[PDB]
Structure 1
Amino acid sequence: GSADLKAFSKHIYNAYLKNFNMTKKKARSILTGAPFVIHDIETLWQAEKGLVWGLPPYKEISVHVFYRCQCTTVETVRELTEFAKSIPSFSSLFLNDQVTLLKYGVHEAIFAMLASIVNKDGLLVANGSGFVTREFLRSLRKPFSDIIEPKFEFAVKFNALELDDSDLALFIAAIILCGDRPGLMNVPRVEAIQDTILRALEFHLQANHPDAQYLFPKLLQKMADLRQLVTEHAQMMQRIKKTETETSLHPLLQEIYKD
């Protein structure tokens, strides 16, 4: 019961703090209370020329930005994999089930954690060293600016819920341990693990937020929302694959977007 759920929430939070360089706490402190502002080609060039900062050969500004996004995503996938391994029953699954869960869960988790570094106006990059304006990303030629804006739209609404890192750790864990993923082998184990994570989250939310009896179902709804946000992203990704043939696709992201 309780105190089992308290200890579980604490363990999950500790692994989250162990594995994610940027926390919402740190990010909010940067966004208030300074990072190099990237809002046009000139400031981007300054950032790249030592100021803020491995990539495939240069093609153009929009593809360069797309490449930096891919590199960020690969790094966050590595961190999410280490995080999930520290989740108690995750490592008892067969390695292929672990991979299946990561494959279908990382982008939902990435978009959820993105809100931690987003506000109305832009987002932190390079571990908080830079801040890229939403306006600049809107200015990229597109299908490339189309790809990014729905993430802001999701993030500002998600940040209205005012979660903290301790809540998020459980939220991300529940996203990875999802019983619905196609090709999953031990559906009952994964569902039981998720059930424990979500029960811990309901407890943890009570002990944190005024009431939070409405927040929990809203979070469950956000997980559903994350699913099809990723679906839309994948469609955009596929057509970027179809039409932007000079744009190289990182191999891990190719494997993930496969199917």
Structure 2
Amino acid sequence: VADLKAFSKHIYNAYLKNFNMTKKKARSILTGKASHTAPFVIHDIETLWQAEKGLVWVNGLPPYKEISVHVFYRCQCTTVETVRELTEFAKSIPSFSSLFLNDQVTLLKYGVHEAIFAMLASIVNKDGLLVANGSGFVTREFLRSLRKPFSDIIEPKFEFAVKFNALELDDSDLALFIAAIILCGDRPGLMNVPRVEAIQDTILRALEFHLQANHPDAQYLFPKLLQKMADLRQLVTEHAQMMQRIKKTETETSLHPLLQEIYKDM
């Protein structure tokens, strides 16, 4: 009940090793001061083009179709790369790696979007979000100005993120919060459910211990985080549904196969 402090540190380390962008770095950039190099602000067609024209960034994107789809492709490509980082993060958790590969896939399948939305909060403020490794900032107004359905995808995530960031979690908190999301014993079709539940429980106890040390004055922070985890599950449900509509009504839009596997039988 004290080596929990070690468990946490192993998880913070797996986090620091596998994620391209920490919240700490993200916030130093969004707050402007500390990095002395402002991100390129993308807020219309003209600046988006300036940004593709080298100021910030193709990138193995599917064939061009139109502005709203191009932005979709940028987000989709980032999503896939974050799935890849989350996969490595989870694998750097010894307990996770002991599970059979089919249980690993089940947990990633059902957890990555929840985790992704939680980490989006790190690179977001009420006005927009960091793209291209911190070197760009895409405004929330611009994303809202895109053709429906694409202008509806990210909005609920901003709404989640602004409330989420109010809790002032740091990376060490987030490492445990993402672990708890991946290591969930409720995911449909798990094989060794007792094993995963067991690992989940350790992580949650580690998280509460961690939060006491790290946020001594914060009242009810653990329960609030358990609620947020439930909010995320609702978020992913809606995302999958929107993505179902884009697949049905937006046929010129190329959907990445990995993400198609995730939504399949969700």
* Partner of residue 40 from structure 1, selected from 40, 44, 63: 44
Hey, what's the Cα distance between the residues in 1 that align with 2:7 and 2:81?
26
> CA offsets, 1:54-87, max 9 Å, x none?
0000000000000001100010000000000011
C-alpha offsets along residues 31-61 of structure 1, whole Å, 9 cap, x if unaligned? 0131000000000001101111100000000
Give runs of ≥4 in structure 1 deviating > 6 Å. none
Determine which of 78, 83, 104 is the counterpart of 1:77.
83
TM-score between the two structures when normalised by the length of structure 2: 0.95
The offset of 1:182, in angstroms, is 0.6
Give deviations 1:201-221, integer Å, cap 9, x for gaps: 000000011333400000000
SS in structure 1 of the partner of residue 137 of structure 2: strand
Per the alignment, in what secondary structure is the counterpart of residue 82 of structure 1?
helix
| Shift in Å, 1:88 | 2.0
> Residue 230 of structure 1: CA displacement?
0.5
Aligned partners of 2:175 and 2:94: how far apart in 1?
13
Deviation at 1:192, TM superposition (A): 0.5
SS in 1 for 2:146: coil
1:101-134 deviations in whole A, cap 9, x for unaligned? 0000000000000000000000000110100000
Task: Tell me if the contact between 1:9 and 1:200 (Cα under 8 Å) persists in the aligned partners.
Answer: yes
Instruction: Give a deviation string over 1:211-249, Cα, whole Å, max 9, x none.
Output: 334000000000011001100111111001110011010
Instruction: Provide the C-alpha distance between the structure 2 equivalents of 1:196 and 1:232, rounded to a whole number of angstroms.
Output: 30
Q: Is 1:176 aligned to 2:175, yes or no?
A: no
- In structure 2, C-alpha distance between the alignment counterparts of 1:182 and 1:150, rounded to whole Å: 25
What is the CA–CA distance in structure 2 between the aligned matches of 1:8 and 1:52, rounded to whole Å? Answer: 38
Conserved in 2, the CA contact under 8 Å of 1:125 and 1:132? yes
TM-score, normalization: structure 1? 0.98
Report the 3-state secondary structure (helix = DSSP H, G, I; strand = E; otherwise coil) of the residue aligned with 1:140.
coil
User: How far is 1:21 from its partner?
Assistant: 1.2
Deviations 1:138-160 (Å, cap 9, x if unpaired)? 00011111111000000000001
Question: Conserved in 2, the CA contact under 8 Å of 1:97 and 1:186?
Answer: yes
Deviation for aligned residue 1:257: 1.0
CA distance in 2, matches of 1:249, 1:155: 25
Structure 1 vs Structure 2: percent identity of aligned residues?
Answer: 100
Equivalence for 1:151? 157
Deviations along 1:183-203, whole A, 9 cap, x unmatched?
A: 110111000000000100000
Q: Secondary structure at the match of 2:214?
A: coil
Contact 1:206 1:213 in 2 (8 A): no
How far apart are the structure 1 equivalents of 2:208 and 2:78?
A: 31
* Conserved? CA contact 1:122–1:133, under 8 Å: yes
List alignment gaps of at least 5 residues for structure 1: none
SS of 1:37's equivalent in the other structure is strand
Comparing 136-145 and 205-214, the one that deviates more: 205-214
Tell me, in whole angstroms, the C-alpha distance in 2 between the residues paired with 1:253 and 1:49. Answer: 28
For structure 2, list consecutive stretches of 5 or more residues without a partner in the other structure. 33-37
Structure 2 matches for 1:1-259, cutoff 5 A? 3-33=2-32, 34-53=38-57, 54-259=60-265
Aligned equivalents of 1:189, 1:213: Cα separation in 2: 31
Cα distance in 2 between the residues matched to 1:252 and 1:51: 30
Q: Report how many residues are paired.
A: 257
Deviation at 1:4, TM superposition (A): 0.7
In structure 1, distance between residues paired with 2:71 and 2:172: 31
Alpha-carbon distance between aligned partners in 1 of 2:104 and 2:45, rounded to the nearest angstrom: 41
* Separation (CA, whole Å) in 1 of partners of 2:20 and 2:213: 26
Q: Distance in 1 between matches of 2:229 and 2:235?
A: 10
